[PDB]
Amino acid sequence: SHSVKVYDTCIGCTQCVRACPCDVLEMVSWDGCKAGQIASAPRTEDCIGCKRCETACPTDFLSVRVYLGGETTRSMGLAY
Amino acid sequence: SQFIKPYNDDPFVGNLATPVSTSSFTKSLLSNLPAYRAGLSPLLRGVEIGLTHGYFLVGPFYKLGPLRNSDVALLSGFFSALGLIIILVACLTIYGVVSFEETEAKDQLQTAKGWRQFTSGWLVGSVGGASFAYILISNIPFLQTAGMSML
Amino acid sequence: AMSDSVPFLKQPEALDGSMAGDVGFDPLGFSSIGDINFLREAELKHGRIAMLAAAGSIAQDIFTFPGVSKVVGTAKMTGVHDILVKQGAMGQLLLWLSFLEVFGTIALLETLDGKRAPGDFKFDPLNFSKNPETFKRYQLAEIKNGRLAMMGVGGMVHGYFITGKGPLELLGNF
Amino acid sequence: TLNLQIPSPTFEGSTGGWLRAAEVEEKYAITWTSPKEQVFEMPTGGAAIMRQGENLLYLARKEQCLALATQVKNSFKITDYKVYRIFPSGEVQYLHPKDGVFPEKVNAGRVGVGNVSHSIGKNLNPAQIKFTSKSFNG
Amino acid sequence: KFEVSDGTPYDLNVPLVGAASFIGWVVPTLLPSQIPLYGGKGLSTAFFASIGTNLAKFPAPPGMTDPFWLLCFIWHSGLFATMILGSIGYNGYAA
Amino acid sequence: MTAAYLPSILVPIIGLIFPGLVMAFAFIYIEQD
Amino acid sequence: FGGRGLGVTVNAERWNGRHAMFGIFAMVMTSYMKGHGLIPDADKILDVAQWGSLASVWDGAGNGISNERAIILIAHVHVLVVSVIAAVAPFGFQDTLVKEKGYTPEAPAGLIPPFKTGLTPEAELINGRLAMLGIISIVTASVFTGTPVVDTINLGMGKILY
Amino acid sequence: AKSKAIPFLDAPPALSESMPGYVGFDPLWVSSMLPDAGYVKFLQEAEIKHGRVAMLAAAGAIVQDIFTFPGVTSVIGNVKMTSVHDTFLSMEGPGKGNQAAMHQLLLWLGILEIATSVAIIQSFKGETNRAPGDFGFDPLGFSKKAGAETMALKEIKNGRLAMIGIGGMVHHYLLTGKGPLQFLGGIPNYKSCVSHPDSLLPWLIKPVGAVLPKIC
Ligand code: CLA
Ligand code: CLA
Numbered sequence A: 001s002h003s004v005k006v007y008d009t010c011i012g013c014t015q016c017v018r019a020c021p022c023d024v025l026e027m028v029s030w031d032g033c034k035a036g037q038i039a040s041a042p043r044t045e046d047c048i049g050c051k052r053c054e055t056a057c058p059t060d061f062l063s064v065r066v067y068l069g070g071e072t073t074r075s076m077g078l079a080y
Numbered sequence B: 001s002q003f004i005k006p007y008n009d010d011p012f013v014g015n016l017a018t019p020v021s022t023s024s025f026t027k028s029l030l031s032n033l034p035a036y037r038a039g040l041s042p043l044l045r046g047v048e049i050g051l052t053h054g055y056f057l058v059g060p061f062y063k064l065g066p067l068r069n070s071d072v073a074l075l076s077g078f079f080s081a082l083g084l085i086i087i088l089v090a091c092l093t094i095y096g097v098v099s100f101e102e103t104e105a106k107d108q109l110q111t112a113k114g115w116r117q118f119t120s121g122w123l124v125g126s127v128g129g130a131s132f133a134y135i136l137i138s139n140i141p142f143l144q145t146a147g148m149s150m151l
Numbered sequence C: 001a002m003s004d005s006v007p008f009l010k011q012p013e014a015l016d017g018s019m020a021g022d023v024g025f026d027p028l029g030f031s032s033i034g035d036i037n038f039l040r041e042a043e044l045k046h047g048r049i050a051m052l053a054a055a056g057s058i059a060q061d062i063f064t065f066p067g068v069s070k071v072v073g074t075a076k077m078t079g080v081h082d083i084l085v086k087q088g089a090m091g092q093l094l095l096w097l098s099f100l101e102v103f104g105t106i107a108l109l110e111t112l113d114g115k116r117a118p119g120d121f122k123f124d125p126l127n128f129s130k131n132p133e134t135f136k137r138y139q140l141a142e143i144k145n146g147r148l149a150m151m152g153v154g155g156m157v158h159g160y161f162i163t164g165k166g167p168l169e170l171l172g173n174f
Numbered sequence D: 001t002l003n004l005q006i007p008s009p010t011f012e013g014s015t016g017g018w019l020r021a022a023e024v025e026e027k028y029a030i031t032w033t034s035p036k037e038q039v040f041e042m043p044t045g046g047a048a049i050m051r052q053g054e055n056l057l058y059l060a061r062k063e064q065c066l067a068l069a070t071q072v073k074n075s076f077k078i079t080d081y082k083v084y085r086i087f088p089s090g091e092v093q094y095l096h097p098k099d100g101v102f103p104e105k106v107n108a109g110r111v112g113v114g115n116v117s118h119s120i121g122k123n124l125n126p127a128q129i130k131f132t133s134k135s136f137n138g
Numbered sequence E: 001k002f003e004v005s006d007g008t009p010y011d012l013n014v015p016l017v018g019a020a021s022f023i024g025w026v027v028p029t030l031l032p033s034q035i036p037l038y039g040g041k042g043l044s045t046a047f048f049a050s051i052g053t054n055l056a057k058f059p060a061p062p063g064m065t066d067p068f069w070l071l072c073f074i075w076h077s078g079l080f081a082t083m084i085l086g087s088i089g090y091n092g093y094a095a
Numbered sequence F: 001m002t003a004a005y006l007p008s009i010l011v012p013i014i015g016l017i018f019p020g021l022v023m024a025f026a027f028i029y030i031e032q033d
Numbered sequence G: 001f002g003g004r005g006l007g008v009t010v011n012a013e014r015w016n017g018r019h020a021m022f023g024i025f026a027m028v029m030t031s032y033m034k035g036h037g038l039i040p041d042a043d044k045i046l047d048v049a050q051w052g053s054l055a056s057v058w059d060g061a062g063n064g065i066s067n068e069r070a071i072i073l074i075a076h077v078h079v080l081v082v083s084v085i086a087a088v089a090p091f092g093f094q095d096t097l098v099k100e101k102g103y104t105p106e107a108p109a110g111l112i113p114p115f116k117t118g119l120t121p122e123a124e125l126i127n128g129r130l131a132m133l134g135i136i137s138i139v140t141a142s143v144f145t146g147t148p149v150v151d152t153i154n155l156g157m158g159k160i161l162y
Numbered sequence H: 001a002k003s004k005a006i007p008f009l010d011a012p013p014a015l016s017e018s019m020p021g022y023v024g025f026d027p028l029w030v031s032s033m034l035p036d037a038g039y040v041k042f043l044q045e046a047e048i049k050h051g052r053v054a055m056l057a058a059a060g061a062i063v064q065d066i067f068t069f070p071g072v073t074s075v076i077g078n079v080k081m082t083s084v085h086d087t088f089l090s091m092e093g094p095g096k097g098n099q100a101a102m103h104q105l106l107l108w109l110g111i112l113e114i115a116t117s118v119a120i121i122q123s124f125k126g127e128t129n130r131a132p133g134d135f136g137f138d139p140l141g142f143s144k145k146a147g148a149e150t151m152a153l154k155e156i157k158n159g160r161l162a163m164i165g166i167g168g169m170v171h172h173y174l175l176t177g178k179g180p181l182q183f184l185g186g187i188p189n190y191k192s193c194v195s196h197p198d199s200l201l202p203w204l205i206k207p208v209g210a211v212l213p214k215i216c
């Protein structure tokens, strides 16, 4: 599966979670930013690797990062 | 009066029920083919399929091969058909080796023993059909000239 | 279970034995592919046309109508057709038989719905078949003579193709 | 819990539906409730009419289900949709929304997975972690 | 009980459509023409005469310049058009 | 050419039997679990 | 591989012994038929205009395969087709070439199996090992002396064949 | 379980002793070559047809030596065993000649054989419980006679014997050119060989000169 990391530069804008087509990311409680929330990736086995979350991230260099790894049926987006 | 319906009454499967796919003529022809006909061992399915395919394999090799203008054109064409048959039998064997787990079930094509039986039948049928085509073309001048002997 | 005509074959499913001349003879299973009533109407039309052709071949060997020998000369059987295509007799026959066969097509539509027996045109002006037993005997005789006539017309026309004589002249000058 | 007896939208069928891997590896299901019968676009290609009431639909991929969910959310204001994973054995795994609350909203009990406690520029060099099972994050 | 699809029983009406389309195409094409392709006959009759002429010369196929190919193509084109339109009209309207 | 039979013996073997057996055994090796 | 009866197995020893016994027979019969001139037109050089480019040998004279060599190869082609069909579609009673994965290997016979005369597997294995050794010895005696293999057989059998 | 004909070999698994003429003789296990139930029946039917055809061959090969039908020698000459097939076919065909004897035989026998094909297909699948080789042809009622319980054994035995016999007589004609009765009475047949035309498979007699002795 692909690996998705969220670094502590996250401002909790929830844009990466809204951009995710595969429901990989979610918002959890945090105290490191003014929004009081940070992104997390509990479901990276469903990650296709499209990097729409990285496109959605507004922080100078990204807070959410996708590292493409081992390809599975889900990560390759195969309907067969 | 609609001629195209969802396949197997399932609108979300990736198929459509069409006159080419699901008519009575198509269903009868498909259910009566040796690959699908009921009551056949996989060996006999192989025998019928091999007889047909090996029988027609002689013709293009005989008429269009590099030895087609020689007196040994039919012998060369049959030998080329036999080599193709042996190559295809090796293909069938390696497909069955990598595709199937060793199970007790042997009455179905998609089992290891069933595929081995099908391969054996296909080899014997292909050799027999090619030999029958060789005999008929060797002994009938109509088949040697593809009808030009009548002119 | 087994057929009567061919004892080593299973009886055809579409052959119940109700139609006249049914001895379970369908080794190729044509009644399983085509409709049995369509095949029966075809069999009766081929057989009746063959009965007329056989009787006509024999009678045209026996005698010709007045003035026919002026136009046809010594031509017999098949040889007449071409000549009388030019004179116009075959055109008139084609016209009026086609006109009758339009209503025959409507009758085929009736029999394919199941509302008409095959070959039944209700044509009994002389009331020969007033008894259903005599009707059954006449149906059997009609279908047997129709099939025999199909064989006969085949033999007569191919014997004429070989020798050029005709049926009765070949029977005499063999 | 996925009710298998939920009626499906009226669809004429297509060649874009699920293949043999749906019945062999895994399949996905999406249910939602509509206030009226209305035409939506299938994620596999074609137009279907969702019925008034509950709708159950089967797809090959999770992304197809979530695309359909986004379409019915942004075009028909339908937010009650549920996405499940179904295995050949009959096991149904509820997927979305995982805890009942949508992932873009914070919910109690959620724990952070994959969070790194420094900026992305503080990752280790590959030469530092070569021939060693240390992660590049530190 | 011919099913045209998985669960769609449909009457093909092959006898009526074939007979009616054959008669409705052959009879208008009995109209004669003095052009050398027809030879003084109608399209159907010139086609049948060409069939007889080329069957009198078995093995030997009709040549490229022989009128058989053009007669066959036009006759079967009109016949197929008549059969398609007749199937549409009789199977659909049925009245 | 001395031992002129050797090209006609070895070229069909090396060009058809060797790649066929290699492709078959490599297929079995890469597809087996 | 080894779980199917291929490699250094008793199955492979038996199969190569059978083929070697047949090979000794075929070499003796080849020497007999060639010595008596029973191969028709044995020195006729096959022509490329009839048999194609496969007949080309590129020797110093003729550039074609001799008819005897082609006839010997066709005789081998017959039993090769028999071999392919017996390997893929064996008789129900017959010993198979490749064995199933869960098969029971035949015990190695050691120096010599028990002395069961007749149509026994022990006699088959003994004569098979003997025939393989005989092929080795005949080849070595042919290539260390320059005597042709048919002639080496004819001298080793004391000119009985011809 | 061992064979009755071959007491040391094991009995073939597909033979049940139900069929007449079984003595356990199938060393190649041909009856086990297909797992299907009707296959053995198919085999038996083939055997029956072979024997019957062979019987009609063998008697014919004798009777064609004794007398010929009127006008036959004016058409084909003095050919005896397999050059009749060749000579008729040389004079058969539109354009090639006027006879149609072998083609007429092929036509009517092919009608009978297609009608037989349907029966073999039906008996193979199990839609019919008819015995192999049984066509219901008993117009003279010998099955309702006495001693009819061994007629099938005599049929199969004389069938096999006629198979071997016609193989004999044909391979004798191909070498000597005599025919059955002259071959039987002319015991040293290599001292007086009748000149005969080559068959329609002349390549098969090619090794007789070079490979084989060619005594004749
Ligand atoms: C080629 C011959 C031909 C043509 C032109 C038509 C035409 C027509 N039929 Mg029809 N029919 C035919 C043969 C034909 N039929 C035969 C053989 C049968 C018997 C099986 C029937 C049985 C039948 C029934 C039972 C009914 C019709 C009806 C109709 C009408 C509307 C339905 C339709 O098909 O519209 C077709 C539309 C057009 C042809 C006009 C569009 C023109 C474009 C350019 C297409 C034409 C293609 C081409 C030029 C045709 C060339 C013909 C070729 C032979 C040269 C229409 C006038 C129905 C109706 O309402 O009429 C009473 C009806 O109830 N037909
Ligand atoms: C170096 C490899 C190699 C070799 C040795 C050959 C050899 C040959 N090719 Mg060629 N070929 C090759 C590569 C090769 N090809 C490639 C890569 C292509 C693709 C572009 C082709 C495409 C090609 C075509 C399209 C044709 C040939 C033909 C021929 C034959 C020449 C004509 C002749 O006399 O045939 C006479 C032929 C025979 C007497 C029949 C021989 C049958 C053999 C002995 C059976 C062998 C069975 C099999 C290999 C068993 C092993 C299976 C196992 C590997 C799984 C000859 C056997 C022609 C031919 O005749 O094909 C038969 C022909 O039509 N070739």
Ligand code: CLA
Residues within 6 Å of the ligand: H005, H015, H019, H020, H021, H022, H023, H024, H025, H026, H027, H028, H030, H031, H040, H043, H044, H045, H046, H047, H050, H051, H160, H161, H163, H164
């Ligand atoms: C026309 C061929 C023919 C056929 C199809 C059969 C069929 C049958 N015979 Mg039969 N038989 C025949 C001729 C035939 N017979 C003749 C001529 C004789 C007299 C010698 C016999 C004597 C005989 C006996 C004594 C017995 C049978 C039995 C049987 C039945 C068991 C299956 C079997 O053995 O068939 C296999 C035979 C064939 C299919 C004939 C074709 C030959 C095969 C295919 C050759 C294999 C090919 C390959 C090249 C091997 C040849 C070389 C090899 C020997 C090294 C079966 C119904 C048994 C039976 O029914 O018991 C009640 C039995 O005991 N047969």
Ligand SMILES: CC1=C(C#C/C(C)=C/C=C/C(C)=C/C=C/C=C(C)/C=C/C=C(\C)C#CC2=C(C)C[C@@H](O)CC2(C)C)C(C)(C)C[C@H](O)C1
Residues within 6 Å of the ligand: C050, C051, C052, C054, C055, C123, C124, C125, C126, C127, C128, C145, C146, C148, C149, C151, C152, C153, C154, C155, C156, C159, C166, C167, C168, C170, C171
């Ligand atoms: C229904 C209706 C009725 C009507 C009616 C109709 C008019 C009935 C009329 C019927 C006739 C036409 C029946 C004809 C049968 C002909 C066949 C059987 C003979 C075939 C010859 C074969 C054997 C042969 C040939 C042979 C070979 C091949 C070639 C030759 O060398 C030799 C040879 C000749 C021997 C009427 C009007 C009564 C009123 C009634 O109220 C209802």
Ligand SMILES: CC1=C(C#C/C(C)=C/C=C/C(C)=C/C=C/C=C(C)/C=C/C=C(\C)C#CC2=C(C)C[C@@H](O)CC2(C)C)C(C)(C)C[C@H](O)C1
Residues within 6 Å of the ligand: H054, H055, H056, H058, H059, H062, H137, H138, H139, H140, H141, H142, H158, H159, H161, H162, H164, H165, H166, H168, H169, H172, H180, H181, H183, H184
């Ligand atoms: C069904 C049944 C019945 C039927 C019936 C009839 C049709 C039965 C027909 C039967 C046939 C004629 C039986 C023929 C057997 C031939 C064999 C035994 C002799 C073979 C040759 C030997 C081996 C030899 C050879 C030899 C060697 C090789 C070479 C030669 O130099 C010498 C020689 C020639 C001696 C009927 C119709 C009555 C009705 C009933 O209701 C139902």
Ligand SMILES: CC1=C(C#C/C(C)=C/C=C/C(C)=C/C=C/C=C(C)/C=C/C=C(C)/C=C/C2=C(C)CCCC2(C)C)C(C)(C)C[C@H](O)C1
Residues within 6 Å of the ligand: C109, E020, E021, E023, E024, E025, E028, E029, E030, E031, E033, E042, E043, E078, E082, E094, E095
């Ligand atoms: C002239 C000519 C040409 C031509 C041409 C052309 C253009 C040909 C045109 C042909 C046409 C228009 C044919 C129409 C046929 C209609 C039929 C038979 C309807 C049958 C209806 C039925 C049976 C309905 C039955 C019914 C039934 C059972 C149930 C309900 C009631 C009812 C509806 C009555 C060229 C151009 C090629 C050139 C050539 O050189 C000469």
Ligand SMILES: CC1=C(C#C/C(C)=C/C=C/C(C)=C/C=C/C=C(C)/C=C/C=C(C)/C=C/C2=C(C)CCCC2(C)C)C(C)(C)C[C@H](O)C1
Residues within 6 Å of the ligand: H082, H085, H086, H163, H164, H166, H167, H168, H170, H171, H199, H200, H201
């Ligand atoms: C008409 C025609 C032609 C033709 C033709 C024909 C009809 C040719 C030949 C046909 C046939 C059927 C030949 C049969 C040969 C049988 C053999 C050798 C049996 C051996 C049996 C043995 C050894 C039994 C052994 C035994 C067994 C099994 C059991 C134990 C006892 C034992 C004795 C040991 C041509 C080709 C000339 C062409 C021409 O243009 C047209």
Ligand SMILES: CC1=CCCC(C)(C)[C@H]1/C=C/C(C)=C/C=C/C(C)=C/C=C/C=C(C)/C=C/C=C(C)/C=C/C1=C(C)CCCC1(C)C
Residues within 6 Å of the ligand: B051, B052, B053, B055, B056, B124, B125, B127, B128, B129, B131, B132
């Ligand atoms: C034309 C037609 C019209 C248009 C539409 C269409 C349907 C697409 C088209 C069909 C095109 C195609 C589909 C036409 C259909 C074609 C196929 C290719 C016909 C194959 C026939 C195989 C038979 C003859 C071999 C039979 C075995 C014999 C008896 C063997 C005996 C052997 C056995 C083993 C035992 C040993 C002896 C020997 C001799 C070795």
